[PDB]
Coordinates of C-alpha atoms in Angstrom, one line a residue:
Chain A
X11 CA 0.1 0.0 -0.2
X12 CA 3.0 2.2 -0.3
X13 CA 1.9 4.7 -2.4
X14 CA 4.0 5.8 -5.3
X15 CA 6.8 8.4 -5.1
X16 CA 6.4 10.9 -7.7
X17 CA 9.3 13.3 -9.9
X18 CA 9.2 17.3 -10.4
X19 CA 12.0 19.0 -12.2
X20 CA 14.4 20.0 -10.0
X21 CA 18.1 20.7 -12.2
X22 CA 18.5 22.4 -15.2
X23 CA 22.0 22.4 -16.7
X24 CA 21.8 24.6 -19.8
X25 CA 24.9 23.3 -21.4
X26 CA 24.6 25.9 -24.1
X27 CA 21.6 27.9 -25.0
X28 CA 20.5 24.9 -27.1
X29 CA 21.4 22.3 -25.2
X30 CA 20.3 21.1 -22.0
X31 CA 19.8 18.9 -19.0
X32 CA 16.6 18.4 -17.1
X33 CA 16.9 15.8 -14.2
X34 CA 13.1 14.6 -12.4
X35 CA 14.4 13.6 -8.8
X36 CA 13.3 10.3 -6.8
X37 CA 11.8 8.1 -9.6
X38 CA 11.3 4.6 -8.4
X39 CA 13.3 2.1 -10.6
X40 CA 12.1 0.5 -14.0
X41 CA 10.3 3.9 -14.9
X42 CA 13.4 5.8 -15.6
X43 CA 13.2 3.5 -19.0
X44 CA 9.5 4.2 -18.9
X45 CA 9.3 7.9 -19.1
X46 CA 12.4 8.3 -20.4
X47 CA 10.9 6.4 -24.2
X48 CA 7.7 7.9 -23.7
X49 CA 9.3 11.5 -22.7
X50 CA 11.6 11.1 -25.9
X51 CA 8.8 9.7 -28.1
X52 CA 6.5 12.8 -27.2
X53 CA 9.7 15.7 -27.9
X54 CA 11.3 14.2 -31.1
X55 CA 7.9 14.4 -33.1
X56 CA 4.9 15.8 -31.0
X57 CA 6.5 19.2 -30.4
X58 CA 5.1 22.5 -31.5
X59 CA 7.4 24.8 -33.6
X60 CA 7.8 27.6 -35.9
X61 CA 8.8 27.5 -39.0
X62 CA 9.0 28.7 -42.5
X63 CA 6.2 27.8 -45.2
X64 CA 6.1 30.1 -48.1
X65 CA 8.7 32.8 -49.4
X66 CA 7.7 35.5 -51.5
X67 CA 11.1 36.8 -53.3
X68 CA 11.0 40.2 -55.7
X69 CA 11.8 39.1 -59.5
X70 CA 11.6 35.8 -59.0
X71 CA 8.5 33.4 -59.9
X72 CA 9.6 30.0 -59.7
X73 CA 12.1 28.1 -57.2
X74 CA 14.0 27.3 -59.9
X75 CA 14.8 30.9 -60.9
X76 CA 18.4 32.2 -60.3
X77 CA 19.3 36.0 -59.4
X78 CA 20.3 38.2 -61.2
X79 CA 23.0 39.1 -58.2
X80 CA 22.6 36.5 -55.7
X81 CA 25.4 34.0 -55.5
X82 CA 22.9 31.1 -55.2
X83 CA 20.1 29.8 -56.8
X84 CA 16.8 29.8 -55.0
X85 CA 16.4 26.3 -54.2
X86 CA 19.2 27.0 -52.2
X87 CA 18.0 29.9 -50.2
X88 CA 14.8 28.4 -50.0
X89 CA 16.6 25.7 -48.4
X90 CA 18.8 28.1 -46.5
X91 CA 14.9 29.6 -45.6
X92 CA 14.3 25.8 -43.7
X93 CA 16.7 26.4 -41.3
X94 CA 15.4 30.3 -40.1
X95 CA 14.9 29.7 -36.6
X96 CA 12.2 31.9 -35.2
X97 CA 10.0 32.0 -31.8
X98 CA 7.6 33.6 -31.8
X99 CA 5.2 35.0 -29.3
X100 CA 1.4 34.1 -29.4
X101 CA 0.7 33.7 -33.3
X102 CA 0.3 31.1 -35.4
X103 CA 1.1 32.8 -38.7
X104 CA 3.6 35.9 -38.6
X105 CA 5.1 38.0 -42.2
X106 CA 8.8 38.6 -41.6
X107 CA 10.3 40.9 -44.5
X108 CA 13.9 41.0 -45.4
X109 CA 15.2 43.7 -47.8
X110 CA 19.0 44.0 -48.0
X111 CA 21.0 45.6 -51.0
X112 CA 25.2 46.0 -50.7
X113 CA 27.7 43.1 -51.3
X114 CA 28.3 40.7 -48.6
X115 CA 25.8 37.5 -46.5
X116 CA 22.2 38.2 -46.2
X117 CA 21.7 37.0 -42.7
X118 CA 18.4 36.5 -40.4
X119 CA 19.3 39.6 -38.4
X120 CA 18.7 41.8 -41.5
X121 CA 15.1 41.0 -41.2
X122 CA 13.0 43.3 -40.4
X123 CA 12.3 43.7 -36.8
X124 CA 9.0 43.0 -35.6
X125 CA 8.8 43.0 -32.1
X126 CA 6.7 39.4 -31.6
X127 CA 9.2 37.9 -33.5
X128 CA 12.7 36.7 -32.4
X129 CA 15.6 35.6 -34.0
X130 CA 17.3 32.6 -32.5
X131 CA 20.2 32.7 -34.9
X132 CA 20.6 36.1 -36.4
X133 CA 24.1 35.2 -37.6
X134 CA 22.3 32.2 -40.1
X135 CA 22.6 32.8 -43.6
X136 CA 19.9 33.2 -46.2
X137 CA 21.4 34.9 -48.6
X138 CA 25.2 36.5 -50.5
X139 CA 24.3 39.4 -52.4
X140 CA 27.2 39.5 -55.0
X141 CA 27.8 43.1 -57.1
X142 CA 26.8 45.8 -54.9
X143 CA 23.7 46.9 -57.5
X144 CA 22.8 43.7 -56.1
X145 CA 19.5 43.8 -53.9
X146 CA 16.7 41.7 -52.0
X147 CA 13.5 42.3 -51.2
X148 CA 11.3 39.2 -50.1
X149 CA 8.5 38.1 -47.8
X150 CA 8.7 35.3 -45.6
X151 CA 5.9 33.6 -44.3
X152 CA 6.5 31.2 -40.5
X153 CA 3.7 29.6 -39.3
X154 CA 3.1 27.1 -35.3
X155 CA 2.7 23.4 -36.4
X156 CA 3.7 19.9 -35.7
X157 CA 6.0 17.2 -36.7
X158 CA 7.4 17.6 -40.6
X159 CA 4.9 18.8 -43.3
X160 CA 6.9 18.9 -46.9
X161 CA 5.7 21.2 -49.4
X162 CA 4.5 18.6 -51.5
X163 CA 1.5 18.4 -48.8
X164 CA 0.1 21.1 -50.6
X174 CA -0.3 31.9 -57.8
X175 CA 3.5 32.9 -58.2
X176 CA 4.8 32.2 -54.9
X177 CA 6.6 29.0 -53.4
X178 CA 6.7 26.4 -50.9
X179 CA 8.7 25.3 -48.6
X180 CA 8.9 22.3 -46.9
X181 CA 8.3 23.0 -43.2
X182 CA 9.7 21.6 -40.0
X183 CA 7.9 22.6 -37.1
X184 CA 9.7 20.5 -34.6
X185 CA 11.7 21.9 -32.4
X186 CA 14.2 19.4 -30.8
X187 CA 16.6 18.6 -33.2
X188 CA 18.0 15.7 -30.6
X189 CA 17.3 13.6 -27.3
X190 CA 19.3 11.4 -24.8
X191 CA 18.6 10.0 -21.4
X192 CA 20.1 8.2 -18.6
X193 CA 18.6 6.8 -15.9
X194 CA 21.3 7.0 -12.8
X195 CA 20.7 6.4 -9.3
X196 CA 19.3 8.8 -7.2
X197 CA 20.6 10.3 -3.7
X198 CA 19.2 10.8 0.0
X199 CA 19.6 7.8 2.2
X200 CA 15.7 7.4 2.4
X201 CA 13.6 4.5 0.8
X202 CA 17.4 4.3 -1.3
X203 CA 15.9 2.3 -4.3
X204 CA 15.3 5.8 -6.5
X205 CA 16.6 7.1 -9.7
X206 CA 16.4 9.8 -11.4
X207 CA 16.0 10.9 -15.3
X208 CA 18.4 13.0 -16.9
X209 CA 17.2 14.4 -20.4
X210 CA 19.9 15.6 -22.6
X211 CA 17.8 17.8 -24.9
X212 CA 19.6 19.9 -28.1
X213 CA 16.9 21.9 -29.3
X214 CA 16.9 24.7 -32.1
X215 CA 16.3 27.5 -29.0
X216 CA 12.7 27.9 -29.7
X217 CA 11.0 26.2 -26.1
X218 CA 12.7 26.2 -23.4
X219 CA 13.8 22.7 -21.3
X220 CA 11.2 22.9 -18.7
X221 CA 8.0 24.1 -20.8
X222 CA 9.2 20.7 -23.3
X223 CA 9.2 18.1 -20.3
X224 CA 5.9 19.7 -19.1
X225 CA 4.4 19.5 -22.6
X226 CA 5.4 16.0 -23.1
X227 CA 4.0 15.1 -19.6
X228 CA 0.9 17.2 -20.7
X229 CA 0.8 14.9 -24.5
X230 CA 1.0 12.0 -22.4
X231 CA -1.1 12.6 -19.5
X232 CA -3.6 13.1 -22.1
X233 CA -3.5 10.6 -23.9
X234 CA -4.4 8.2 -21.1
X235 CA -7.7 10.5 -20.3
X236 CA -9.0 6.9 -18.9
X237 CA -10.4 4.1 -20.7
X238 CA -14.0 3.3 -21.3
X239 CA -16.2 0.6 -22.6
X253 CA -31.9 13.3 -50.4
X254 CA -33.1 15.1 -53.5
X255 CA -32.6 18.7 -54.5
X256 CA -29.7 19.8 -56.7
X257 CA -26.2 19.9 -55.4
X258 CA -26.1 23.0 -57.6
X259 CA -27.7 25.1 -55.1
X260 CA -25.5 25.3 -52.4
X261 CA -22.4 26.3 -55.5
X262 CA -20.9 29.7 -54.2
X263 CA -21.9 32.3 -56.7
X264 CA -18.2 32.6 -57.8
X265 CA -18.4 29.7 -58.9
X266 CA -21.2 31.3 -61.9
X267 CA -18.4 32.9 -63.3
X268 CA -19.8 36.4 -63.7
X269 CA -17.8 40.3 -63.9
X270 CA -16.3 40.8 -60.9
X271 CA -18.4 44.0 -60.5
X272 CA -21.4 41.5 -60.7
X273 CA -20.1 39.3 -58.2
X274 CA -19.2 41.6 -56.5
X275 CA -22.8 43.3 -56.0
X276 CA -24.5 39.9 -55.2
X277 CA -22.0 39.2 -52.1
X278 CA -22.9 43.4 -51.3
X279 CA -26.6 41.8 -51.8
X280 CA -26.4 38.8 -48.9
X281 CA -26.4 36.9 -52.0
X282 CA -23.4 34.3 -51.6
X283 CA -25.1 30.9 -53.5
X284 CA -26.5 30.0 -56.2
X285 CA -29.4 29.2 -54.2
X286 CA -29.7 32.7 -53.1
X287 CA -29.7 33.8 -56.5
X288 CA -32.4 31.7 -57.6
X289 CA -34.4 32.9 -55.4
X290 CA -33.7 36.7 -55.6
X291 CA -36.3 38.0 -58.4
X292 CA -35.9 40.6 -61.4
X293 CA -37.5 43.3 -59.9
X294 CA -35.8 42.9 -56.5
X295 CA -32.4 42.9 -58.4
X296 CA -32.8 46.1 -59.9
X297 CA -34.3 47.8 -56.9
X298 CA -30.9 47.1 -55.5
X299 CA -28.2 49.9 -55.6
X300 CA -25.6 48.9 -57.5
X301 CA -27.3 46.1 -60.0
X302 CA -28.2 47.8 -63.9
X303 CA -29.6 46.2 -66.9
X304 CA -26.6 44.7 -68.1
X305 CA -26.0 43.3 -64.6
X306 CA -29.0 41.8 -64.4
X307 CA -29.3 40.5 -68.5
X308 CA -25.6 38.8 -67.9
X309 CA -26.6 36.8 -64.9
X310 CA -30.0 35.7 -66.9
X311 CA -27.6 34.5 -69.3
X312 CA -25.4 32.8 -67.0
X313 CA -28.4 31.2 -65.2
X314 CA -30.2 29.7 -68.4
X315 CA -27.0 28.6 -69.6
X316 CA -27.5 26.4 -66.4
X317 CA -30.5 25.8 -66.7
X318 CA -31.2 27.8 -64.0
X319 CA -33.1 31.3 -63.3
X320 CA -34.1 33.9 -61.5
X321 CA -37.5 33.7 -59.2
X322 CA -37.0 29.9 -58.6
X323 CA -38.9 28.5 -56.1
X324 CA -36.8 25.7 -54.1
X325 CA -39.2 25.8 -50.9
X326 CA -37.2 25.4 -48.2
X327 CA -34.6 27.2 -47.6
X328 CA -32.8 25.4 -46.1
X329 CA -32.5 22.5 -44.3
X330 CA -29.8 22.2 -41.5
Chain B
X1045 CA 2.1 19.4 -92.5
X1046 CA 2.6 20.5 -89.0
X1047 CA 1.3 24.0 -88.2
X1048 CA 3.1 24.8 -84.9
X1049 CA 5.0 22.6 -82.2
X1050 CA 4.6 23.5 -78.3
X1051 CA 7.1 22.0 -75.8
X1052 CA 6.2 22.7 -72.5
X1053 CA 9.2 21.7 -69.4
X1054 CA 7.8 20.7 -66.4
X1055 CA 10.2 20.2 -63.1
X1056 CA 9.4 17.9 -60.5
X1057 CA 11.1 16.9 -57.2
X1058 CA 11.4 13.4 -55.8
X1059 CA 11.8 12.6 -52.2
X1060 CA 12.7 8.5 -51.4
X1061 CA 9.8 6.6 -50.7
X1062 CA 8.7 2.6 -49.7
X1063 CA 9.8 1.0 -53.2
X1064 CA 12.8 3.5 -54.5
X1065 CA 15.9 1.3 -54.9
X1066 CA 19.6 2.2 -52.8
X1067 CA 22.6 1.1 -53.8
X1068 CA 26.4 1.0 -52.3
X1069 CA 29.2 0.5 -54.2
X1070 CA 29.8 -2.9 -53.0
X1071 CA 27.3 -4.9 -55.0
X1072 CA 24.5 -4.3 -51.9
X1073 CA 21.7 -2.9 -53.5
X1074 CA 17.5 -2.9 -51.6
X1075 CA 14.7 -1.8 -52.3
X1076 CA 13.4 0.9 -49.5
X1077 CA 10.2 -1.0 -47.7
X1078 CA 9.4 0.7 -44.8
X1079 CA 9.6 4.6 -43.4
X1080 CA 10.1 4.6 -39.9
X1081 CA 9.7 7.7 -37.7
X1082 CA 12.6 8.9 -36.3
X1083 CA 11.7 7.8 -32.5
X1084 CA 11.0 4.5 -33.6
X1085 CA 15.0 4.1 -35.2
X1086 CA 17.8 2.5 -32.6
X1087 CA 20.2 5.0 -31.9
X1088 CA 23.1 5.9 -30.0
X1089 CA 23.5 6.5 -26.1
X1090 CA 23.9 9.9 -26.6
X1091 CA 20.5 10.0 -28.4
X1092 CA 21.8 10.2 -32.4
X1093 CA 19.1 7.9 -34.2
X1094 CA 20.8 5.8 -37.1
Chain C
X1194 CA 45.4 2.1 -39.6
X1195 CA 41.3 2.3 -39.3
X1196 CA 41.6 1.0 -35.7
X1197 CA 44.1 3.9 -35.4
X1198 CA 41.8 6.5 -36.3
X1199 CA 39.0 5.0 -34.9
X1200 CA 41.1 5.3 -31.1
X1201 CA 41.5 8.9 -32.3
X1202 CA 38.0 8.6 -33.2
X1203 CA 37.3 7.0 -29.5
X1204 CA 36.2 3.8 -30.4
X1205 CA 34.9 0.6 -30.1
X1206 CA 37.9 -0.5 -32.0
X1207 CA 35.8 -3.5 -33.7
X1208 CA 33.5 -0.4 -35.3
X1209 CA 30.2 -2.3 -32.3
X1210 CA 28.4 0.1 -30.5
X1211 CA 25.6 -0.4 -28.1
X1212 CA 22.5 0.2 -29.6
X1213 CA 19.1 1.1 -28.1
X1214 CA 15.9 0.1 -29.6
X1215 CA 13.9 3.4 -30.1
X1216 CA 11.1 1.0 -29.8
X1217 CA 11.1 -0.2 -26.2
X1218 CA 14.7 1.9 -24.8
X1219 CA 15.9 -1.5 -24.0
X1220 CA 19.2 -2.0 -25.6
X1221 CA 19.7 -4.5 -28.4
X1222 CA 21.3 -7.8 -26.8
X1223 CA 24.6 -7.6 -28.5
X1224 CA 26.9 -4.8 -29.8
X1225 CA 26.2 -3.6 -33.2
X1226 CA 27.9 -2.2 -35.7
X1227 CA 27.4 0.9 -37.0
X1228 CA 29.4 3.6 -39.3
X1229 CA 28.6 6.0 -41.9
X1230 CA 28.0 4.1 -45.4
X1231 CA 28.1 6.0 -48.9
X1232 CA 24.9 5.0 -50.4
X1233 CA 23.2 6.3 -53.9
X1234 CA 19.9 5.9 -55.1
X1235 CA 19.3 4.4 -58.5
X1236 CA 17.4 5.5 -61.4
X1237 CA 14.7 2.8 -60.8
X1238 CA 11.9 4.5 -59.3
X1239 CA 8.3 3.0 -58.8
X1240 CA 7.1 6.6 -59.5
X1241 CA 8.2 5.5 -63.0
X1242 CA 7.5 1.8 -62.8
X1243 CA 4.2 1.2 -60.9
Chain D
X12 CA -2.0 22.1 -32.4
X13 CA -4.1 19.8 -30.9
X14 CA -4.0 15.5 -31.6
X15 CA -6.4 12.8 -32.4
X16 CA -7.3 11.2 -28.9
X17 CA -10.0 8.5 -27.6
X18 CA -12.1 7.4 -30.8
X19 CA -13.6 4.2 -31.3
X20 CA -13.5 1.7 -28.8
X21 CA -13.4 -2.6 -29.2
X22 CA -13.3 -5.2 -26.3
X23 CA -12.8 -9.1 -27.8
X24 CA -13.1 -11.7 -24.5
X25 CA -10.9 -14.3 -25.2
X26 CA -12.4 -15.8 -22.7
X27 CA -14.0 -14.9 -18.8
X28 CA -10.6 -14.1 -17.5
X29 CA -8.9 -13.1 -20.8
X30 CA -9.5 -9.7 -23.1
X31 CA -8.3 -7.5 -25.5
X32 CA -9.6 -4.1 -25.9
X33 CA -8.6 -1.3 -28.7
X34 CA -8.2 1.9 -28.8
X35 CA -8.5 3.1 -32.3
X36 CA -6.5 6.2 -33.9
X37 CA -3.9 7.0 -32.1
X38 CA -1.0 9.1 -34.1
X39 CA 1.6 7.1 -35.5
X40 CA 4.3 6.5 -32.5
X41 CA 1.9 6.2 -30.4
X42 CA 1.4 2.8 -29.9
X43 CA 4.9 1.7 -29.1
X44 CA 4.4 4.6 -26.7
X45 CA 1.9 3.6 -24.6
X46 CA 2.3 -0.1 -25.3
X47 CA 5.8 0.7 -23.6
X48 CA 4.5 2.4 -21.0
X49 CA 1.6 1.0 -20.3
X50 CA 3.0 -2.6 -20.2
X51 CA 5.9 -1.4 -17.9
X52 CA 3.2 -0.8 -15.2
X53 CA 1.1 -3.8 -16.1
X54 CA 4.9 -5.9 -15.2
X55 CA 5.7 -4.5 -11.6
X56 CA 2.9 -1.7 -10.5

């Protein structure tokens, strides 16, 4: 009936800015490997981190392009952007602007200082401007997520493979814990090598939180579909579409219910537009003043 | 007889996947059968997975 | 000579190291050789063949 | 920013004292994680 001795974060040894040694004190034997593996498994794949997902470089259209005045090709640049370690306050998407003219390396330190955004490694090279009349202006999109989400996991913009997880490497040691009482206790030492996005203690409490939350106990057509299509599917003129949306007509079902009289009474619609709308509707077997009687169901 | 010819060059990036073939210089060849997440991988004491 | 480099490497001389199973955390019951091998991806890809 | 947690359960009573419970849709890698954590608690605690 001896109640179990529970752990609590006891020491943090920051070997460096991105390498630490967390230690949970007084754990009953065998629990070293149990928690060691549960935690190592959560940390190495379930951690939340910011990562570059899209990039908009001026003058560049396809990632295969190479730039006038830039040493490395756009592909190498995106590959460089993959390694952009950013820690953002409380947001799931932030746009970073990078304007740089001159000769020499364009590092992360040249990124426009945003109040929320923290740049872990400012000396991180993104580019190399060759001639002194060369310059880059790009918009780097940084988003919050989980795990490795490739660019293939799908406009004149480019997509970059997302490596959301903040942690590079995890290691653990079981080591016998001190204290003359009981004697048969161990201490789990988790050696972390992160990218600097996340603090050791919160990484541990988040791995633990995910574990605990996984353990949350163990317990024991009629009608036409076209009516629910957005009005944009009708491919009207920009003006007509905008007018209809301005009249709270967002779907085909909304449009076919209105009558000519009612539509012409609206501030922004004239004879031209109504003619166009009747034409596009008639072209798909539809019209104005259509009764569907039951708008809508659920 | 030919009025016009159009050529379109499309570029594709292929990532290693199950069924692709890898080999070494010594005659050891094989096909990828499994891609298992990093935490399942055998690793050195200092935490480095193979 | 390779043994010598392994010594500067800090060894094991055989080239075998203790390896942990990522699913369990239990070590594999014997020492296992682990080293950097040079491997090529061949022109035969499932995308082309399937 | 979530994770797929508790979904659809099954119980195969092999006998009066032997069963097979199954927790469905747990994110990849959680199989061995929970499997080993639980196997370790059950075999000793």
